[PDB]
A and B are shown apart, each in its own frame.
Chain A
Amino acid sequence: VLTGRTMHCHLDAPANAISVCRDAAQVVVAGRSIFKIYAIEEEQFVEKLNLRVGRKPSLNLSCADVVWHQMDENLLATAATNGVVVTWNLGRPSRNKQDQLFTEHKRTVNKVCFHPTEAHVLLSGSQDGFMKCFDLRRKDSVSTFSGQSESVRDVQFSIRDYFTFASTFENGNVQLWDIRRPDRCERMFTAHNGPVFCCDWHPEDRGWLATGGRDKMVKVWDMTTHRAKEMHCVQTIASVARVKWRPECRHHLATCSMMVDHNIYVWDVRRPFVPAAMFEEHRDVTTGIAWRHPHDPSFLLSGSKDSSLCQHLFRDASQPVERANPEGLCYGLFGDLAFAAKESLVFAGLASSALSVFETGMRWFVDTAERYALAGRPLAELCDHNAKVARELGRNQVAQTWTMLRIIYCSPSRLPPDFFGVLVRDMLHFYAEQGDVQMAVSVLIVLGERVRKDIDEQTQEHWYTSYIDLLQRFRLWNVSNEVVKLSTSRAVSCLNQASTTLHVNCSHCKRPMSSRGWVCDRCHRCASMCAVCHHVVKGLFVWCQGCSHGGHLQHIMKWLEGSSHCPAGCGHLCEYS
């Protein structure tokens, strides 16, 4: 088979199309401002014969699509933007190898084709959206075909068939034609939500056709049945221009993009979400890709706008599949631990996972939070209550800690006064290091001024904030506000005084009422009255945001438990349903 290695060479001008011979030794490349051929060598490919003969440019110089004839190696076809198709005869001794010139088309010609068996059939379409056929016997070649759609993009012959070829139209529909009945349509359907840019057949199957659209989609169509059907749906990161299929691999595909993306991607139908292979050798947009041999999936021919031609080998692909983390992990607040991993590690048997939340641990936190006493009693009883709270939970060291504090600071030729302060400070610091920020804050609050003048002010904020965050994780709101009320630092206290005061009005006169009082300054009315008890609301006042009716906190809660109507009688379904 073909042998070689991956290599690249630098061209002179950007290329928009490429073609290769059946000998698989010389590659022919055409472009807007370049036209040359190169012979492929295992050491280094070298040019064979350039087609840019004559310093005079022509309207046919800017060739967009080039094809190497599949029957004779002496015939080459070119599609130009000036609506002229120029064939080339390599056997002509003259440098200008032109054979037949034909300029029926007015708009830019997009694609050309050669008959796999017949040596005189060419099929091309222009941007005008009218489909035109060709004859190389110099006879009446005029059999042009009614597209009745937008501009044609790609047309390709069916190798299995003899008189059937595909036609794609920018309107979003793909039409399958026949050449024996130029009158009526055979097969038409809508394939993509937008223009279709390519269409290829199966080298082995006779009913596989894959078409690519601008919506970053490649789908395969089956024509065997009386109705068209789709089996495959491959999503790409960018739009797909043209697709080549890997020989001797029925489930492999190759695609390339035209904006944003520059890489070449290889896909498998059985894995419609991940790419099989991909190359990053090119720098600019990859434009022309074709398989070197109709049976060797080893070497690939590719080119770009950066004016270079490159060849790639299948075993040299960079594989992202081998660099993908197969498992995930996450801890949780209550103690649960979710975990997912690949099925095979716990055609292909590894295409799934299994979520498994490994449940079953911090009930000593909320229980201590809910019954600790922090203010409202003198020091001795506060210490005793907390010692008991620690004792019943089973934590002993905390209980002796609280009892020693009670002993240490209550009811004493004596010990020096400032004797135990260092030990208290060290005990607090030690308790903070382990991560028990619950006891440190409690001791700080209980003691107060007797210890507040010994700890750095940037550490107290750390402890307080960590404790508050932990409490708010478990949704213990009253305890958190209790801490915010008697915090030793001014920074913590002013946390609940940030935009927590409302301004009220009077719906009759729209004036804003003052702070203290329940009467209006202009209407001389009572703007706050219970919609239920018809008394004056001086304390708490509930409200509704749909109709502005409310009253006492408990009256509305009691009434609304049974009925779903606004008490004021405005026919509004307060608290929907």
Chain B
Amino acid sequence: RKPLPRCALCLINMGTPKKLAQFNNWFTWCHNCRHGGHAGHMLSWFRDHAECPVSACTCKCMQLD
């Protein structure tokens, strides 16, 4: 009964329980730097930019793959 990591964009902690669990609330993390976020938010952010949302990062966590 202790919090899980929080999204880097919406700043609200993750979690998952007629779709009771939509795709946009699934976990996601860059495998090279391990900076997580939601699904919808990250798919939104990584369209106009190319850099990790968390500050002081240098990874380009879409162009790697």
Residues of A in contact with B (beta carbons under 8 Å apart): 477-478, 480-481, 484-485, 493-504, 515-516, 518, 528, 537-545, 550, 552-553, 556-557, 560, 575-577
Contacts and interface: CB of A to CB of B under 8 A. Distances in A.
Contacts of B26: 542-545, 550, 575
Contact of A496 (B22, B23, B33, B55): B55
A477 B44 contact: yes
Given A499-B6, A539-B61, A478 B11 contact: no
Interface in B2-58: 3, 5-11, 13, 16, 18-23, 26-36, 39, 41-46, 48-49, 53-56
Contacts of B32: 516, 538-539
Contacts of B64: 538-539
A496 B36 contact: no
B28 A541 contact: yes
A481 B34 contact: no
B23 A557 contact: yes
Given A481-B53, A553-B39, A540 B30 contact: yes
A-B pairs with the 6 shortest C-beta distances?
Answer: A539-B65, A539-B64, A543-B27, A545-B16, A576-B20, A477-B9
A interface secondary structure, majority = loop
Contacts of A539: 30-32, 61-65
Nearest to B29: A502
Contacts of B7: 500
Contacts of B35: 500-501
B43 A481 contact: no
Contacts of B63: 539
10 contacts: A478-B48, A500-B7, A500-B36, A502-B29, A502-B34, A504-B31, A516-B32, A542-B39, A575-B21, A575-B26
Contacts of A552: 65
A553 B28 contact: yes
Contacts of B56: 493, 497
Contacts of A516: 32-33
B62 A543 contact: no
Contacts of B8: 481, 496, 500
A543 B32 CA distance: 16
Given A478-B44, A541-B29, A545-B16, 5 more contacts: A499-B6, A539-B31, A540-B31, A557-B43, A560-B23
A493 B57 CA distance: 12
Contacts of B18: 576-577
B31 to A, nearest CB: 5
Given A493-B55, A575-B19, A481 B9 contact: yes
Contact of B11 (A496, A515, A538, A540): A496
Contacts of B49: 478
Contact of A515 (B5, B22, B34): B34
B23 A500 contact: no
A575 B22 contact: yes
A541 B8 CA distance: 15
B19 A500 contact: no
Contacts of A499: 3, 5-6, 13
A540 B64 CA distance: 9
B3 A494 contact: no
Contacts of B62: 539-540
- Most B C-beta atoms less than 10 A away, residue of A496, A540, A550, A575: A540
A496 B54 contact: yes
A175 B19 CA distance: 53
Contacts of B41: 477
Nearest to B3: A499
B42 A553 contact: yes
B36 A553 contact: no
Contacts of B21: 545, 575-576
Nearest to A561: B23
Contacts of A515: 33-34
A502 B36 contact: yes
User: Chain B CB within 10 Å — which of A500, A537, A542, A545 has the most?
Assistant: A500
Contacts of B19: 575-577
Contacts of B45: 477-478, 481
A107 to B, nearest CB: 51
B36 to A, nearest CB: 5
A541 B53 contact: no
A276 to B, nearest CB: 48
B33 to A, nearest CB: 8
Nearest to B64: A539
Nearest to A492: B55
A576 B18 CA distance: 7
Contacts of A498: 6
Contacts of B5: 499-502
A504 B6 contact: no
A96 B58 CA distance: 103
